[PDB]
């Protein structure tokens, strides 16, 4: 029943998923002045040289590029993490207009979109078990602003018209997620949750300070996708973001400055 409309959007999720109103929900506004620099935070280690993408799917909420996570091929470690986390998929959240789209905000500033590279803690053996643990996931978030094209995004952008509607999927091999990264790995980090239902409180959020730039034509191609399935009335897939949630009893730490 859940989605991003007036009748089934974020404001409604608590009825089906009461943890919507819980103690460590995401996303949040990052208040850059009150985030605490922590000199013991390690550099983030992103090892994506052996990444194996498999498929891309429109799930009716976003599109997901899914990876083979049956071996240690594409992993995240270091940073605030004390375990190895395997890349399972990435997806984006974006807006109807360039002035909104991101889930995390920075001093209340919204970005055009937000990339989530979803990773799960290998001590829990698989993604389904990890999500049931307070330290089960590590999600690397990267802001997108509109300006110059991101060449590493283009192969993603070019396949979207093959997965226009809910439930469509396409083969998507040999995609290199290193082409979606900014120069700097400086980050903010805090304990939070999935930002869609089931909203499980199982995520260590790692949000990069440096946005990537995408072109107006790249982000336009995102807004051409559909929430509906093939042969149903067209609802453009836009504004598939959850707003900032109360920080409550949490401190956001910074790896820098
Ligand atoms: C195999 C698989 C992978 C993923 C990421 N989600 C699912 S079900 C949806 C889900 O659990 C999920 C949705 C959204 C997010 S987010 N927006 O990055 O916080 C995450 Cl981490 C998980 N299933
Ligand atoms: Zn997400």
UniProtKB/Swiss-Prot annotation:
Q: What's in the keyword line of the UniProt record?
A: Acetylation, Cell membrane, Cytoplasm, Disease variant, Lyase, Membrane, Metal-binding, Osteopetrosis, Phosphoprotein, Zinc
**Predominant location category:** cytoplasm
The effect of residue 62 to F is: Reduced activity
**What's the catalysed reaction?**
hydrogencarbonate + H(+) = CO2 + H2O; urea = cyanamide + H2O
Q: Where does substrate bind?
A: 195-196
Which residues make up the annotated site Fine-tunes the proton-transfer properties of H-64?
A: 4, 59, 64
Query: What happens on changing residue 59 to V?
Result: Reduced activity
Its Enzyme Commission number(s) read 4.2.1.1, 4.2.1.69
Site positions (Involved in the binding of some activators, including histamine and L-histidine) are 89
Q: Altering residue 141 to R: what's the impact? A: In OPTB3; complete loss of activity
Q: What is the effect of changing residue 194 to F?
A: Normal activity
- Which terms under GO biological process does the entry name? angiotensin-activated signaling pathway; carbon dioxide transport; morphogenesis of an epithelium; neuron cellular homeostasis; positive regulation of cellular pH reduction; positive regulation of dipeptide transmembrane transport; positive regulation of synaptic transmission, GABAergic; regulation of chloride transport
- What Gene3D superfamilies is this protein classified in? Alpha carbonic anhydrase
A GO term from the CC aspect: apical part of cell
The residues listed in the UniProt record as binding Zn(2+), with positions renumbered to this chain, are: 91, 93, 116
Give the recorded effect for residue 59 to T: Reduced activity
Q: What is the effect of changing residue 61 to G?
A: Impaired activity, not rescued by 4-methylimidazole (4-MI)
UniProt cross-references to Pfam families, sorted A to Z: Carb_anhydrase
Q: Which GO terms describe its molecular function?
A: arylesterase activity; carbonate dehydratase activity; cyanamide hydratase activity; zinc ion binding
What disease is this chain connected with?
Osteopetrosis, autosomal recessive 3: A rare genetic disease characterized by abnormally dense bone, due to defective resorption of immature bone. Osteopetrosis occurs in two forms: a severe autosomal recessive form occurring in utero, infancy, or childhood, and a benign autosomal dominant form occurring in adolescence or adulthood. Recessive osteopetrosis commonly manifests in early infancy with macrocephaly, feeding difficulties, evolving blindness and deafness, bone marrow failure, severe anemia, and hepatosplenomegaly.
Stated role: Catalyzes the reversible hydration of carbon dioxide. Can also hydrate cyanamide to urea. Stimulates the chloride-bicarbonate exchange activity of SLC26A6. Essential for bone resorption and osteoclast differentiation. Involved in the regulation of fluid secretion into the anterior chamber of the eye. Contributes to intracellular pH regulation in the duodenal upper villous epithelium during proton-coupled peptide absorption.
Family, as annotated? Belongs to the alpha-carbonic anhydrase family.
- Its protein name is Carbonic anhydrase 2
Q: Which organism is it from?
A: Homo sapiens
